[PDB]
Design a protein around this ligand. Structure first.
Ligand SMILES: *O=P([O])([O])O[C][C]1O[C](N2[C]=NC3=C2N=[C]N=C3[N])[C]([O])[C]1[O]
Length: 639
DNA sequence: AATGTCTGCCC
DNA sequence: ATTCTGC
DNA sequence: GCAGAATGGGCAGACATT
């Protein structure tokens, strides 16, 4: 009966009925166009609550009509390929994608490239493209082609990905090509990501319980509730799903349990366990110690060195298997044979399993001192052998999430940290507890902040010990504070840099400039040397003003005294004129930027770590910008 | 063999 | 990673 | 304050090209 064309699917309508308002039939694969139309409706709105309801409508229809497609539809909505620990990646960026578009349309790659840049969205290019009879795309078919792309490996694999991609585009109808392309480029731009997908899912399976006989007698379990009881109930079901997901961020595990046992019984089937990465506790920036004392009020807190390495979530399973996961739940085990072989040394004989929250820091065993993050990044990644490791690592342990088969997630940090100290064993330069200070005295805190930089850290992490001090990400994901010198007004490295070029903006930046190429003044050669790009720190209004004043400085070709070497050629070369104050966290030795090359190193120039716009220096012309010699001086002052 | 470009993921 | 902003 | 979307530098690895 339901022969509604998916082109008319409207998951945003009032009084959405999961069966009758779907654009597909019970037992039919969810059409990809149904997902694209949901994306369109989500795009058109800015209230996340409207977005969540719209997605929820789609999901309720999937649960009611096509339950096996729930997982692909969710992954499509998250724009992921599977669980984060499986390390599946498309291996497709704008390069492979635009080359695929060019072939599907007959156009030259430069033309497509130029249009994508101007429109700021590869989706608009693929959609408005003449594709110089295939069945309609389904959600699971598209999902599975994405996974086919990601699995393609070896010589000629790029051509094989382009072929799959072209096959997708030739079957696309209406808005499908826009979202296929946006999916492949990695930016859906819905205004809706993981938190809203979770809210939509918990809402969907609460209103339309999975697993009923068809047609479901219970299509809207909110209908018997007052508005206020409905809100309270959806919030509680949502919290169940979110807290479970933060401990087990694996839809492949969660969805079957959801579909079979329902959401209220989810915690009984999915729990934190070693070997499945969990979502890490994150930190909010603070702009000074006073801000720390106020945000925390009367809560006792501790300060810890903020080490400059990579987060390493170390799992030791019952039975001895050791896994190491990144901050993003990627499996880094194969990267760290040195750490696996040192686990025996770090725990008492009674420790049978754990999840440790640590920072892996590059460590010079000769000098017994910390090495910079840049050195850490020269470690091999895949399938590393333990004897060939050149850059040793020292683990700085700061949290214990799971111990001897018990979750510590609801334990306050005071207790988790005590359990860390009591059950684990320090070895200098191999595994040590984060340097810490428990105080509320500004003097000691300021001094400790100073000491951490002198001890080659970035600053401090500040964490309450007992008040709201648990590790429950679903309750507050940014429960910690980070205090870095470069956050403090007038403390960090600031530079005055010449804007030499602009890059057309993507997404909401389309039609203006999203980034800028900046240069220092090389006094000796009287040239401007590219030092970094810049794309954060301006309000939207400033960004519109920058575009409006700088488009008048656009040059057809660059000045001959403007050296950019390996930096990305700007979309618009700009007459050097505008001078901007830029803050950064650090200077780095750069493989591409020419700024100050030969003043520290004969071949490498210098770039900025985490540059951000502070303000225009309308009082300066290019010759008053920070010089390359000063950039070198700053770099050496880092020691 | 060597080099250059693209990508994913660290921050 | 930093930063901005509509809700 | 959340959640999301803009955006930064730079590495190893995987390919492509020569
Ligand atoms: O938000 P940021 O990504 O800048 O910082 C969080 C990040 O810092 C790392 N870290 C180092 N030392 C730490 C620590 N986190 C928590 N406690 C201590 N002592 C860690 O990798 C975080 O992800």
């Amino acid at each position: 009966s339901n022969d509604m064309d998916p082109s008319g699917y409207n998951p945003a309508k009032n009084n959405y009925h999961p069966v009758e308002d779907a654009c597909w039939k019970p037992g039919q694969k969810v059409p990809y166009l149904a997902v694209a139309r949901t994306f369109e409706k989500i795009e058109e709105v800015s209230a996340r609550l409207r977005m969540v309801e719209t997605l929820s409508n789609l999901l309720r229809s999937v649960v009611a009509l096509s339950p096996p497609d729930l997982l692909p539809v969710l992954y499509l909505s998250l724009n992921h390929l599977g669980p984060p620990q499986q390390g599946l990646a498309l291996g497709v960026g704008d390069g492979v994608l635009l080359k695929a578009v060019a072939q599907a349309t007959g156009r030259q790659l430069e033309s497509v490239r130029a249009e994508a840049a101007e429109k700021g969205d590869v989706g608009l290019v693929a959609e408005n493209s003449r594709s110089t009879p295939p069945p309609p795309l389904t959600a699971s078919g598209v999902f599975s082609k994405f996974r086919d792309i990601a699995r393609l490996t070896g010589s000629a694999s790029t051509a094989k990905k382009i072929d799959i991609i072209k096959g997708l585009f030739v079957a696309c109808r209406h808005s499908e090509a826009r979202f296929i392309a946006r999916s492949l480029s990695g930016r859906l731009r819905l205004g809706l990501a993981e938190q809203s997908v979770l809210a939509a899912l918990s809402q969907a399976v609460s209103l339309t319980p999975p697993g009923q006989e068809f047609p479901p007698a219970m299509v809207d379990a909110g209908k018997g509730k007052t508005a206020e009881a409905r809100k309270t109930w959806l919030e509680e079901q949502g919290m169940i799903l979110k807290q479970t997901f933060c401990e087990v961020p694996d839809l492949d595990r969660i969805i079957p349990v959801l579909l079979e046992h329902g959401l209220e019984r989810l915690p009984e089937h999915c729990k934190l366990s070693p070997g499945i990465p969990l979502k890490p506790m994150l930190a909010h920036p603070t702009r000074g110690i006073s801000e720390v004392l106020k945000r925390f009020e009367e809560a006792a807190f501790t300060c810890e060195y903020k080490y400059d390495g990579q987060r390493a979530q170390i799992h030791a399973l019952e039975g001895g298997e050791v896994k190491i996961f990144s901050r993003n739940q990627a499996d880094n085990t194969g990267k760290y044979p040195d750490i696996i072989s040192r686990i025996p040394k770090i725990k008492l004989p009674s420790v049978t399993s754990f999840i440790l929250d640590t920072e892996a820091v590059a460590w010079d065993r000769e000098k017994k001192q910390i090495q910079p993050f840049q050195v850490l990044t020269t470690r091999k990644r895949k399938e590393v052998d333990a004897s060939e490791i050149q850059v040793q690592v020292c683990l700085y342990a700061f949290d214990l999430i799971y111990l001897n088969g018990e979750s510590l997630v609801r334990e306050p940090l005071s207790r988790r940290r005590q359990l860390l100290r009591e059950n684990f064993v320090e070895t200098e330069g191999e595994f040590v507890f984060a340097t810490s200070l428990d105080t509320k005295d500004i003097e000691q805190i300021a001094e400790f902040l100073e000491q951490s930089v002198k001890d080659s850290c970035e600053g401090l992490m500040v964490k309450t010990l007992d008040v709201d001090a648990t590790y429950e990400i679903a309750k507050r994901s940014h429960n910690w504070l980070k205090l870095k010198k470069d956050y403090l007004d007038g403390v960090g490295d600031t530079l005055d840099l010449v804007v030499i070029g602009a890059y057309l903006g993507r997404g909401k930046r389309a039609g203006r400039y999203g980034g800028f190429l900046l240069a220092s003044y090389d006094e000796d050669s009287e040239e401007l040397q590219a030092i970094c790009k810049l794309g954060t720190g301006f309000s939207d209004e400033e960004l519109e003003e920058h575009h409006q004043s700088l488009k008048a400085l656009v040059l057809p070709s660059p000045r001959p005294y403007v050296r950019i070497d390996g930096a990305v050629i700007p979309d618009h070369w700009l007459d050097p004129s505008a001078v901007w104050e830029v803050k950064c966290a650090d200077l780095s030795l750069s493989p591409i930027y020419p700024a100050a090359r030969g003043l520290v190193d004969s071949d490498k120039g210098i770039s900025l770590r985490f540059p951000r716009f502070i303000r225009v220096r309308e009082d300066k012309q290019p010759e008053q910008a920070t010089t390359s010699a000063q950039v070198a001086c700053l770099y050496r002052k880092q020691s």
